[model samples]
Every structure is written in C-alpha cells, then in structure tokens.
Target: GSHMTTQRYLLDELETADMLEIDGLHAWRFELNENLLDQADLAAEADQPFASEDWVLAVESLDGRTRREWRFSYNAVMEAEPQADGESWRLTTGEGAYQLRCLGAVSASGEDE
Candidate 1:
C-alpha cells in the first residue's frame, strides 16, 4: 500500500483548476466538461494558459459559488514544481509546503501503449 498527504486540494482538484485559491470553497463537486476541457486544450496548444475565468464560469453555471463570488480566483502566489530527481511534485502555498508524491502507474491494458 501507499500513503501521503494532499496539499489540500481534493477541493482544488475541484475539477481541473489551472491555479489554486487561498480563501476556501462551498457546496460540493462540479461535473466539469466542455468549457473546462476546451480551455485546457487551447491553453495546452498555446504557451500554457490558466483559465481562471472558465473556472469561474463553470462554477457559476453549476450554480456553485467561489470565495466572495470569484474574488479569490486565480492563485498566482502558489507554486507547483517538479524535484530535480523527478520523484515528486512540490506544491507550495501561503499555508505551507506540501508534496504530490508520485507512486507511478501503468495501465495493464495494451491500450496504454
């Protein structure tokens, strides 16, 4: 078995957030699609953009609210970087420093290749 601690983002993982927020959240999960994925593809094809607006739009479209109504969207002070040995990803924020440990995975299906 494996174990580790989150940088506190089963919430931030709140549907493919391009950036992190500090204030916190509300309601429950958001079923992200269309806008979220499209923006992602666009950003990827570009110079890596963060769609803070798309995040907000998706949230509102779902009737969900974010800190003070999109006031706390787009966390720039935060940092997510890979370690030199490339074992884990470092997730840093004003709260503290945490790690995204990479246990590694491979699809048993030939489709993985």
Candidate 2:
C-alpha cells in the first residue's frame, strides 16, 4: 500500500509512578507520557494541510533495567482510503527512563488520539 507522512505535535508529558510485580519480583515503574495535541498533524504534508481525521496514538514501554535499555513507540491511524495519510508515525518526544526495577516486563502501555 502507498504510504504518506504527516507532521506530529508534542502536546504534553506526564510523569507517574506505578508498581510492577512479576515472579516474586517487585519494582516501581516511572515514565514520561507524551500527548498529541491535534489530529490534523497526522495529515500528509504532501497531500494537504492538517485535516480532521480519526486516529489513535499508542505508546508501549519495554523495560530493560539490567540491560540498561528502554524504549517507547508511537503509532498513528488515519480515516481514509489508502490509509497513507497517517500510518505508523513515530514520535520522538517524551522519551525517558525508569529509576529502579527488579523484574523484566512490559512496564506500561497506553493509547490516545
């Protein structure tokens, strides 16, 4: 399928703490959440300016305390044919780290649009 790129806006960042338990292991999970302000930003720059479209922003946190590696991702969906307007747009904002951990697992996952 044909793919199109779109501009992304950095809305805000959220900081929160949660408890994680796995296999008799317990840990605290901390993260900086990012929010996309507008959906128009998902519009393809080449096709048109920012347009109103239905979309979803999903964030997943992969914890690697012992390995010292952590990551977050953003995925976008558009409401139109070709679906190229906004598909899998990567967000580079609101990326942070966890302070302490005693287990390895998916710390947190969320979605917003």
Candidate 3:
C-alpha cells in the first residue's frame, strides 16, 4: 500500500509514531516527559495554545550518544505547511529549519492473517 498523509498536531501524532526522521537521521528513541504531558493536557482542556518552554521532544542519535532536542510551539506546528515531499512537515526553530517525519507501520501483502 502507498503512504497516507494527514495534518495533525505533533504531540497528538507522536503517540503512535514509532520513529522520527529529523534532517537525515532516523531517531528511533525519543521522549516526552510526564510533566510536559500533563501540562499539555491542561492546555488542551482549556483550549489554550501550548506554550511550554520545556523541551517537548528529545531524540537520541542512532549511536545513542549524540542528543538533540526541540521545544516546538504548538501554534507554529499547527500552521506549518507540508514539506516539498508532501509526506513530511517542516519545523523552523532557533537552531535552523528541520524536516520532521513521524514514521510508523504500514500494511504489506502476505504478512499476517
């Protein structure tokens, strides 16, 4: 099957995303802390934009040494346009422009029952 793309909040999408492709590296290990998660929920319940200054995403390198993080603003990602590939989204931060793809499973023929 082909790829099916949809626009949604990053935090909301991260739940089912198995990996995140930042720039050119496949960051399979990432995290969102408990405090951040709960705070996000509060903001969500109040229908207020999430403006936490804390790092919302922390991803380790493939080697598990080098680390990078981002505190993406909810409003920015909410209004971000799809990347040129039409499959990923672009995030502009103080570091620079980054292409983020939340990857997950896909169905293939002759797999399971």
Candidate 4:
C-alpha cells in the first residue's frame, strides 16, 4: 500500500517583507539571493578598476551573524587604473581585504527565481 502524509503549518506564523536602513551609509534589503558569491569575477573583467569599487565586502561577528554585506555597483564611480586581462583588483577595508579578478561571467541555468 502507498501512503502519503501532508504537513500543515500556520500562515499567520510567517512574516513577509523586511526593511533595513542605515544613516549615512548604504542600505540593503534581505533576500535569498542577496549574497555575494563571486568577487574575483569583477576584478578580472573590469576595463578600469579601483580598490574601492571592484569588490564586495561582507562581515560576520563571532556569533556567525552577518553584520554587513555590500558591493560597489557599476555606477558607484571609482577611480583607479585600468586592469588588463589576467589582473585582479585588491582592496583593504575595515572588515577585511578582498580581491576581485575577472574570469568572465559564469554560466548558470536560465531558470528564474
């Protein structure tokens, strides 16, 4: 015999929509795909890159909670020398350091979230 079980939960127990704002700094909304996965790809592919605008920075405390995570957008306006192929960008921030090297955009499944 084949049997199936259904799981039930309360819809009211779930919370949707969250907002975050930081004064004098960048603010971001949380989402499942909000994480920065590849930093090296930005540095290696930039025609002209800088220490500040070519990387993503993320920090977590001892409790393993993310304190902040952000990246410099393409329009962030950075000043640095032009990077050639095979070169990477390096940046030193208060949280830590990062290196972004371009390896070209990664190929992924075309499915949308």
Best by lDDT: 3
If ranked by lDDT, best first, what sequence of candidates would result? 3, 1, 2, 4
Model 1 bad stretches (over 4 Å): 1-37, 51-78, 106-113
Every model's TM-score: 0.35, 0.20, 0.64, 0.23
Expressed as tens digits, the lDDT of each residue in 1-113 for candidate 2 is: 11121222221111111342222234343333223323333343345444332222222334564522233332312221121322112232344222222223342334331
Higher-ranked by TM-score: 2 or 4: 4
- State the lDDT of candidate 4 residue by residue for 32-56, as single tens digits: 2112222222442443222333333
Give the clash total for candidate 1.
Answer: 0
> What is the TM-score ranking, best to worst?
3, 1, 4, 2
Per-residue lDDT of candidate 1, residues 1-112 (tens digit): 0011233323234333333222232322223344444554465456464445322222221233433222112332123455564433354645455443322233111211
Q: Tell me the whole-model lDDT of each prediction, alpha carbons only.
A: 0.33, 0.28, 0.57, 0.26
Candidate 4 has an lDDT of 0.26
Question: 107, model 2: CA deviation in Å?
Answer: 14
C-alpha displacement of 69 in model 4, angstroms?
A: 5.5
Q: What TM-score does prediction 2 earn? A: 0.20
Candidate 4 stretches with Cα past 4 Å from truth are 1-70, 73-86, 105-113
